[PDB]
Amino acid sequence: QQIAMETYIRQRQLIMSPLITSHVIGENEPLTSVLNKVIAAKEVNHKGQGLWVSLKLLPGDLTQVQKNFSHLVDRSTAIARKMGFPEIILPGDVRNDIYVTLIHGEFDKGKKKTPKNVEVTMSVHDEEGKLLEKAIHPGAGYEGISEYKSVVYYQVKQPCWYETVKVSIAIEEVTRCHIRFTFRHRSSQETRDKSERAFGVAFVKLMNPDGTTLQDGRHDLVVYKGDNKKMEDAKFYLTLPGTKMEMEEKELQASKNLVTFTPSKDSTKDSFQIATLICSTKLTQNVDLLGLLNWRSNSQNIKHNLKKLMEVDGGEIVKFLQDTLDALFNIMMEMSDSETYDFLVFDALVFII
């Protein structure tokens, strides 16, 4: 219903700093023109699910799940291509909009006939074991340390208990700290001194071993359970990534290779999807950091992986071209660098402009 105008006072009381009713947002007239043309109309929500959004998303919520998760600000930012960008993109701190879709996962004991549901306990720690109090992991709008009291739906026990994850983190911290898949049961009994605790956790690999960051590609992650002493430190999980890569390329085809640890396969569903969305700035397809100095070969043209590379690196391609031209091998240098690097630049920076 309609009432008198009080936007500015409430806005500045929310922000608690001297702003203006439209100084925070410039209304981006051409950008919002194109946005109202394609996105800000019904179309992106048309493609959200099925025919439309109000009378069709509710049946989806009632049957299996609603798409209310996976906030849209990531996609709106990643397609709209706003103007007021900072220069602290790659160094300093990340955009803090990274969101990974934890589609499924459960703490099903298996031995017990009736599964007991436990919400995800985002226990944040370090390689050395730093506390990581309310100051570090929260601050982006995520207080999920207290997410507990899991009650099953009326029909199916399988669906997980995942929600929005928001982290305000820096490059040094993402280099250092680590997080675990803890599941502490919040039973009806008030006392938490019983033996209903988490039987195991799994750590999160923030950067791939070759130097690549988190990736959007589908890599379901499992957990490994056991005594608390073998996972209270980080070295044991540091040397055991517990990812899909080691199950085949490490010659770990036999599931009994681990002395005590057991993957979730044939134990619990634990389909932990990884999705480094387009809004992220650390996306990496081919490892450019070797391309700087320790480049084994010119495998970055035939296997260039011609994806975006939105220039958050700060001049990687042109500096590498400068060094390669200094090398003075032969024609293939120039032909490759031209026809791939300026290919990508003239195919992405055009939309950037």
Side-chain angles (χ1 to χ4, degrees):
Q1 76 177 6
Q2 190 193 338
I3 193 66
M5 295 296 172
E6 49 182 352
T7 52
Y8 188 32
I9 293 162
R10 309 285 190 105
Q11 170 194 8
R12 71 192 291 176
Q13 280 162 353
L14 288 152
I15 309 169
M16 293 180 183
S17 63
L19 272 296
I20 315 168
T21 192
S22 301
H23 183 265
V24 59
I25 305 165
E27 283 177 38
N28 311 347
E29 283 287 318
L31 195 55
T32 192
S33 305
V34 179
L35 278 150
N36 300 18
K37 264 188 164 72
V38 291
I39 293 169
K42 282 192 269 291
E43 276 84 17
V44 289
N45 276 317
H46 281 295
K47 73 202 188 76
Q49 159 182 336
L51 212 66
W52 201 48
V53 176
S54 308
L55 202 62
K56 267 286 300 176
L57 280 185
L58 284 168
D61 176 271
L62 192 145
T63 55
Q64 175 64 50
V65 60
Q66 167 67 288
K67 293 184 186 292
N68 52 321
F69 305 139
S70 81
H71 40 278
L72 187 71
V73 304
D74 302 333
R75 206 209 37 73
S76 277
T77 42
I79 290 190
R81 269 63 177 249
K82 35 178 290 176
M83 183 278 288
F85 270 64
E87 280 283 330
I88 321 297
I89 302 187
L90 186 134
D93 54 338
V94 290
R95 190 181 300 169
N96 303 323
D97 282 328
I98 52 171
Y99 166 81
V100 289
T101 79
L102 277 296
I103 48 167
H104 292 278
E106 200 202 3
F107 196 59
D108 181 30
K109 291 172 184 302
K111 307 296 180 178
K112 199 160 187 176
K113 279 86 175 176
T114 62
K116 266 183 176 55
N117 55 342
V118 182
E119 201 160 10
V120 287
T121 313
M122 189 87 78
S123 297
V124 286
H125 289 300
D126 192 1
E127 195 176 349
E128 62 200 19
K130 197 176 175 308
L131 177 59
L132 271 77
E133 80 268 17
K134 186 73 68 68
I136 299 164
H137 188 83
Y142 181 49
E143 317 297 314
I145 296 90
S146 298
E147 287 285 328
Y148 307 116
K149 194 63 203 301
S150 280
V151 174
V152 66
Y153 207 66
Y154 299 86
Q155 273 64 68
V156 189
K157 187 77 63 64
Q158 281 282 266
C160 181
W161 269 72
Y162 183 59
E163 292 87 4
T164 296
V165 164
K166 291 284 189 175
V167 190
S168 288
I169 210 166
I171 177 62
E172 45 173 354
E173 207 56 69
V174 72
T175 306
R176 218 179 165 86
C177 75
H178 291 280
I179 314 162
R180 295 292 171 103
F181 291 100
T182 314
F183 311 98
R184 63 180 76 245
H185 191 59
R186 185 173 173 149
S187 65
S188 59
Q189 294 87 16
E190 199 84 6
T191 311
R192 297 270 66 76
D193 304 325
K194 280 179 263 272
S195 191
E196 294 176 353
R197 316 165 306 265
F199 201 58
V201 305
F203 87 111
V204 178
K205 184 61 82 66
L206 290 155
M207 311 86 78
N208 294 340
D210 58 346
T212 302
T213 76
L214 216 55
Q215 298 297 100
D216 195 10
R218 178 63 179 266
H219 305 102
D220 275 0
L221 195 75
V222 295
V223 300
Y224 291 97
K225 311 162 195 294
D227 45 354
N228 295 325
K229 65 151 196 295
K230 287 192 109 170
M231 65 182 179
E232 67 182 48
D233 47 354
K235 297 300 167 291
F236 275 67
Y237 267 104
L238 179 73
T239 188
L240 185 77
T243 67
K244 199 75 174 159
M245 268 318 301
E246 323 297 326
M247 293 180 183
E248 286 89 7
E249 271 61 68
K250 193 181 165 182
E251 208 68 27
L252 289 193
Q253 306 177 83
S255 181
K256 309 301 165 277
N257 281 336
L258 272 299
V259 64
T260 57
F261 308 98
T262 288
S264 295
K265 304 293 180 59
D266 282 356
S267 190
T268 185
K269 63 191 291 184
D270 267 2
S271 280
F272 297 137
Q273 194 275 333
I274 195 75
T276 315
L277 314 188
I278 318 169
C279 187
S280 315
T281 174
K282 303 299 173 170
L283 291 172
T284 302
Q285 313 83 351
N286 61 6
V287 177
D288 267 353
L289 61 93
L290 275 74
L292 272 298
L293 296 172
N294 309 311
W295 51 279
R296 311 274 78 78
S297 54
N298 293 114
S299 173
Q300 295 214 343
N301 186 11
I302 50 170
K303 305 174 85 64
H304 192 95
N305 286 305
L306 290 155
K307 273 291 169 285
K308 303 151 182 66
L309 281 84
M310 192 95 58
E311 197 55 62
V312 303
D313 44 20
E316 202 269 345
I317 46 183
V318 183
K319 287 161 147 176
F320 169 58
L321 158 68
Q322 294 262 347
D323 296 334
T324 313
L325 281 175
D326 299 328
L328 286 174
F329 297 136
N330 48 9
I331 314 189
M332 283 73 74
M333 294 183 287
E334 300 86 356
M335 65 179 288
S336 169
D337 62 50
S338 180
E339 291 146 357
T340 196
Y341 289 141
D342 283 4
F343 187 101
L344 288 202
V345 170
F346 187 73
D347 292 12
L349 268 293
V350 289
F351 200 73
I352 284 171
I353 304 161

